[PDB]
Amino acid sequence: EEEERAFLVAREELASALRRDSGQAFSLEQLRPLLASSLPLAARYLQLDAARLVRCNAHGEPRNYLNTLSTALNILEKYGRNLLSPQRPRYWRGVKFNNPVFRSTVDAVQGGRDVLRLYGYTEEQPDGLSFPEGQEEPDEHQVATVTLEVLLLRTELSLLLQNTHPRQQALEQLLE
Amino acid sequence: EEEERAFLVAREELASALRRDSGQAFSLEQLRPLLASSLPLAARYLQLDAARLVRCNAHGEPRNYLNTLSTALNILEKYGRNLLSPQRPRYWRGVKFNNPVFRSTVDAVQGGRDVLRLYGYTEEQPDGLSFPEGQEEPDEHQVATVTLEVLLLRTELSLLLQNTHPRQQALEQLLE
Amino acid sequence: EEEERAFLVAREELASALRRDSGQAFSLEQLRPLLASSLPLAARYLQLDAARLVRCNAHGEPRNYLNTLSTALNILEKYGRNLLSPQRPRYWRGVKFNNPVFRSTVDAVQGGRDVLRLYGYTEEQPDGLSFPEGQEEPDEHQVATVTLEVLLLRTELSLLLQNTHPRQQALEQLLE
Ligand SMILES: Cc1c(Cl)cccc1Nc1ccccc1C(=O)O
Ligand SMILES: Cc1c(Cl)cccc1Nc1ccccc1C(=O)O
Ligand SMILES: Cc1c(Cl)cccc1Nc1ccccc1C(=O)O
């Protein structure tokens, strides 16, 4: 109720900020209402499958797999920002699996390819994903809300590795 | 390849045996052409998401989570066998999430519900999954195929816990 | 009956052994005095609600629900051993319900949370159970007693599943 409805406002606030300037950086104080919230995972992440992304890649030491996941999300965050840019990349319509950055970051995480589908890369090819040929422009609101959750989850993982998460003790008990 | 053709004829034979008698037990001898197999995991399990079922539930000690996965697969295997039985259960068309057996086994592993969808439980309700209202009879070939893959994966986990897997040393290095 | 004093001498031996070194395992021969005892259940288990742990979870085939209970007790036994360890885990004061191991093992069994309360996790929060903030150290004598009983029940169930329980036939006539 109180925390819920407030969480959705800051969510749509920062999301609409991404649509205005997709290259804008967000400080810790700007993301604090979303990082310090005690709402369940299913309430904070509506599109990004944060549960499967963490659970299906939590192999080995957290210091390693939290870094593997966060770096993959950094790459996925850049894909979402490029779709909201005033000057979109030339090949924005598709992503190739054999890209060296993609292969070493996103394709090192189970579920990384599924995040692209949330952006709109829903058409599967033997060597990549692409937008439907009938789609002229990406859904700016759908892309922005997914981009924010990717950025939020990456920030959460990054703060945990830095021992600076607002709920660091609570989250660490979910990994040990 | 050569081993690919040998795996298909074995898989179709045990599936036919499942349709012939869904209550019969398969010894390790009858399952050796599929257990002692060397093909990759993606070639042995064509429908059962074995990769996610293990990776997304490999938390804690292998002795524990392999037991949680085996028991969940034992329950799922019984669901598929019941769908092929001549005396089908009067409630074969739906599975309830609050069922005590289902809740303590299948709903204890991420991806357990998705296996029922492979059987044909595609329609989702807040209380469970059910067959389409128009589907008169289950897909016998589809149920037998998935049931065989469930039985295969459960056997692999059980043999690994018993230290009797044909490739026990090779698979154990995939858990370190 | 004087077989209760024999139970007590062995119980206190293994209980004191748990506090001296919480990591040392117990062989089948060391536990045989308690496993083969003809004492009633209410006399062998003084704190662990063994009657409810079995009865309230005996749904489906015994081969399945005995495995579910045994795995939950394996996790609960580890919680007790960690509380008696010289190098206690940094988060010993509380247990989170969302922990992946806990959710799939202890919380799959009715009464699992109650065992944590016997250890000292009496304060209930929406996120889990925790020790009272005033308690500087856990009750080493109470935890060792509960831990030994958890270990005893798990061994009883695991031996029953292996068809090696000293009173296998007598116990099997309580489940069929
Ligand atoms: C967000 C997060 C991070 Cl960054 C690291 C480690 C854990 C979490 N949390 C969760 C992850 C998967 C499933 C549930 C949860 C939960 O919070 O209940
Ligand atoms: C079959 C199995 C068991 Cl039983 C236990 C542990 C691992 C496996 N294998 C795999 C499971 C998931 C993803 C990949 C593999 C692989 O081996 O390539
Ligand atoms: C100990 C045990 C196991 Cl391990 C398995 C199955 C049954 C038992 N026994 C009992 C369990 C619940 C309530 C009463 C009894 C009794 O023995 O009177």
UniProtKB/Swiss-Prot annotation, chains A, B, C:
Changing residue 69 to P: In IMD115; likely pathogenic; may affect protein expression level; linear ubiquitination and NF-kappa-B activation are impaired in the patient's fibroblasts stimulated by IL1B or TNF, a phenotype that can be restored by the reintroduction of the wild-type protein; the genetic variation producing this missense variant does not affect splicing. It is found in: Cytoplasm. Changing residue 101 to A: Reduced interaction with OTULIN. Residues 68-139 form the PUB domain. Changing residue 79 to A: Abolished interaction with OTULIN. Transmembrane segments: none annotated. Expressed in both normal and transformed breast epithelial cell lines. Coiled coil: none annotated. E3 ubiquitin-protein ligase component of the LUBAC complex which conjugates linear ('Met-1'-linked) polyubiquitin chains to substrates and plays a key role in NF-kappa-B activation and regulation of inflammation. LUBAC conjugates linear polyubiquitin to IKBKG and RIPK1 and is involved in activation of the canonical NF-kappa-B and the JNK signaling pathways. Linear ubiquitination mediated by the LUBAC complex interferes with TNF-induced cell death and thereby prevents inflammation. The PUB domain mediates interaction with the PIM motifs of VCP and RNF31, with a strong preference for RNF31. The RanBP2-type zinc fingers mediate the specific interaction with ubiquitin. Belongs to the RBR family. This is E3 ubiquitin-protein ligase RNF31. The gene is RNF31. The chain holds residues 4 to 179 of 1072 of the full protein.
